Amino acid sequence: DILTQLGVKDISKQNANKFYKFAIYGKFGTGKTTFLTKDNNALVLDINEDGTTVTEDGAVVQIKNYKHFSAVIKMLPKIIEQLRENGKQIDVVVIETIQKLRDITMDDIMTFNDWGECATRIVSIYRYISKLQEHYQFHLAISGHEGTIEAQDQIKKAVISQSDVLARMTIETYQYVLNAEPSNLFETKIRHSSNIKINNKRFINPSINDVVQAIRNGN
Amino acid sequence: DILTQLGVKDISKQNANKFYKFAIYGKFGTGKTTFLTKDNNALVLDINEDGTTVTEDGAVVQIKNYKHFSAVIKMLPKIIEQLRENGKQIDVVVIETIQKLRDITMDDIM
Amino acid sequence: MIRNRLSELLSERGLKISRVAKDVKIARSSLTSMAQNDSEMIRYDAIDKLCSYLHISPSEFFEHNPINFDFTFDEEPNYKINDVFEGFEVTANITHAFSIENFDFEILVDVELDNRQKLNFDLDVSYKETEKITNSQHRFIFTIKNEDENIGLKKYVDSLSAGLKNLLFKKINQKLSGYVSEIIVKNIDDIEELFKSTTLHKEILQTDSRLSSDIFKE
Amino acid sequence: MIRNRLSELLSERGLKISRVAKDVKIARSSLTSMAQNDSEMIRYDAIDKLCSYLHISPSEFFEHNPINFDFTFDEEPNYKINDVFEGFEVTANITHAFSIENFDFEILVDVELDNRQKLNFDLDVSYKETEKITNSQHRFIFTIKNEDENIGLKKYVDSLSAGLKNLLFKKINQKLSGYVSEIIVKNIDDIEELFKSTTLHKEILQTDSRLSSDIFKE
Amino acid sequence: MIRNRLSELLSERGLKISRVAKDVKIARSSLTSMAQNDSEMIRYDAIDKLCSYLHISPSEFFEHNPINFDFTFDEEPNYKINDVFEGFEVTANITHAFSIENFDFEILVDVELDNRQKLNFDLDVSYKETEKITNSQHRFIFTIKNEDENIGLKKYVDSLSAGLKNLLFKKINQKLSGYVSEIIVKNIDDIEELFKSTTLHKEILQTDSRLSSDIFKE
Ligand SMILES: Nc1ncnc2c1ncn2[C@@H]1O[C@H](COP(=O)(O)OP(=O)(O)OP(O)(O)=S)[C@@H](O)[C@H]1O
Ligand SMILES: Nc1ncnc2c1ncn2[C@@H]1O[C@H](COP(=O)(O)OP(=O)(O)OP(O)(O)=S)[C@@H](O)[C@H]1O
């Protein structure tokens, strides 16, 4: 089959159960981690930080070194199988901070040559995670700090391009709502098929499930 | 166990008895130290100051030098064991002023 | 056919390779290679030191059989290999890097009897499938197309002692693995992994191919 | 002690070295060296081709004896050599070039039995005379000084088979000839002939020394 | 086996190391090392000065026993080490830095008798656990796998005098500690503490491993 020999594949079947990636950038104390772990079915790879207190249930692994980060990503297939074997439910893998990934990769490589290598490390990680993402049915989520998400463009470009849904979480009694509605002041994008229509792009008390259901089924 | 070999651990068990850290910033004379030592079960590592008068009971250690600060932190495990052995109850370790930590660390690096 | 019997003799007496090497003053690496039939030449000194040490006559050390087999592989094989792409670079699964549409060729075997008379048997071997022995390693499997015409070859093979038969099977496989691996490495370009580094060519050379046929049963 | 029996087997069957080399496809030079016990290593292929060709089991090809002898030569010998002049350059008679006043040293021999037990015998060897085997060639003759103390060594030597004994005598002589020749070449400077050219050093190296003693009778 | 008896003699007479060094004019550091059996060579002058000072004959100074033991460690051991992470940098507890999944190897011991005859015993040693001797220091514990086959070795060991036995046990342990420590330091990278500085490699070298087995009881 010349079709099979090349990578050509049908879209209707590919978009049916696809596991979307989610990037959520927020200001301080906006409860961004709450959203990612609200489903209580998450594995949090936090970096030099411990915000697992807000989460009620799940598995959390502290990352203290770039070497430690490389190991967990390489053995991530094996890990997911064990937590599921233990009966723990993992549907989403979360990296707590993109800025810390910049800091750790920089230490490993320690100029624009250095910055380009740092970008190369970041792009390589996403490609590796994605091939496993299709294999193990795990949603990926990365979170960062507002300062658009704060970082150097080469990274921002890569993150925004690859990310399916990019959202900004803000608090508006006070209410916690995720707003992905288009806007010049802040940049947000949710990907849905032509037939699917999002009547409301702001979600109050949001969870990863609710977003998934909105992007697969009618809002 | 690959899980145990890495640091992956369950959250339900970790958040059950976790000891939370507390940062309390206040204006002058807002009784901020009262709150921290109201439980009367506290060890106050005050820095170049003495506000232990508001507290009723507990243990207070004056910190006068960066070298003194390093020593108490390094031997803090041993200390907690002794005060508890004496029967004094220590459940919270308090550093009176973050700005003084800036001042002392700056002297050490200068 | 001829092989050293050192591995069997040491096992029965229970002596370990390390102790024998220390006493007979022969370097461990050489004695281990000679324990296997891998070495091509043996120094007269080694034959006497070991024979005096294990109170074994030279007869016992070597097993002989007048039979002798020869294998020749076609200079021009028919091979078709189709690149599969699919990002092999991320996960090291050879199947993703390349797929063999069909690889078939002929191996000519001459079973020379003890008498001067010799018999000629011609084997045609074709690709069947790529089995996955372990998650990280695979073994290409090739099956002989014509076996009914060459049934007589099997009668000569099983006549050998078990130790000689195991040696012959290693020889036929080692050559096959080198032949097929060398052909593939040329047609497919190497791909280096993102995350020490294992290039595609190194993985292909490591890969082993074992013939699956009625004639050879072990 | 171990030697190949190819020279004896071929002689009894009457096959010439040339015909055997042509058939077994082994180069004449290698087969001739292996016919003598000069070679140090033998290739497994050679053991089988010859054994199948002469219908001989591997046992027959090798002769073994558990005995084992070792010889060590003194690092510091006592040697006095006096130049004779007398125009050696014209006629190539070594005696004219140089004369040995006295060359004496010790050879230490350890006769290891089949059992772990070993016996030590110490031989003292001295220069006696330079015999003229032919007009153009001479053989230095050295005689063991103490033989009565080392009579027991002789009892172990004659216990070997004739073929092994001839091999051992070649080994002791080859080493002695190399030892004495190397010492002399250094002390005496070379002289080139007027009238291809044969320098004194080349003649000294060619010269052979054979030990003359009761212990060794062949 | 041979050791100096200076430590015992001085203790019975009650003389302190400092006074003896001042009188015999021997530097304290050398006399202390020689008080232990650590030194490898002793100067003739030291043997006489001390012997005249303590009215002791040379016989008394040295204790001798014709027995002699030899230990050889496998060049290729089987070792698996898994990094534990867990922020060792903060608290210096080796266990946090690394964990040994399994480390096993063989030590070959030759007990040479007074007679030329020697006996060979082969010991297989494996990792068991890492005991914590003190809060800041740990001692890896290794246990001999096969002891029943090597019961005879124990009969030779306890035959020595207590002073010689204590010396032999120090020698076997010092070598083991160097062997295991050197292997681990290579596999695990060093980690420097935040708060003089004690790197991981320095701590690993300081760590000592002591064999725990029935054969050695002291
Ligand atoms: N015609 C349209 N009407 C309404 N909304 C639309 C329309 N086209 C796109 N959108 C919105 O934009 C989403 C798709 O954006 P994309 O097509 O991925 O944008 P793009 O600019 O082509 O790609 P990048 O990756 O963002 S540069 C949809 O899910 C809607 O939210
Ligand atoms: N809970 C309280 N209820 C009533 N009065 C209080 C309370 N806490 C503090 N005070 C008053 O404040 C006094 C103690 O003030 P401090 O605890 O010294 O203030 P602080 O802000 O912690 O320290 P500084 O040195 O003034 S910045 C008490 O003696 C009371 O007069």
Author numbering:
A (entry chain 1E): 10 to 119, 127 to 163, 180 to 204, 213 to 259
B (entry chain 1D): 10 to 119
C (entry chain 2E), D (entry chain 3E), E (entry chain 2D): 1 to 195, 201 to 223
According to the publication:
To parasitize a phage, the SaPIs employ a transcriptional repressor, Stl, which in addition to repressing the SaPI genes, senses an active phage infection by binding to the phage-encoded anti-repressor protein. Here, we show that the phage satellite SaPI2, which does not encode orthodox anti-phage defense systems, provides antiviral immunity mediated by Stl2, the SaPI2-encoded transcriptional repressor. Here we have focused on two recombinases, an annealase called Sak, and a recombinase called Sak4, belonging to the Rad52-like and Rad51-like superfamilies respectively.
To demonstrate this, we then turned to Sak452A the filament-forming Rad51-like recombinase carried by the phage 52A. Due to the symmetry of the Stl2 dimers, the two Sak452A filaments are disposed in opposite orientations. Stl2 introduces the end of the wings (the loops 1 and 2) between Sak452A protomers so that one Stl2 protomer interacts with two Sak452A. Surprisingly, Stl2 does not interact with nor seem to affect the nucleotide. Our Stl2-Sak452A complex suggests that Stl2 prevents the Sak452A recombinase from forming long filamentous structures. To validate this, we conducted another spot assay using the SaPI2 stl2-sheetCTD mutational variant challenged by phage 52A. Notably, the antiviral immunity against phage 52A was nullified.
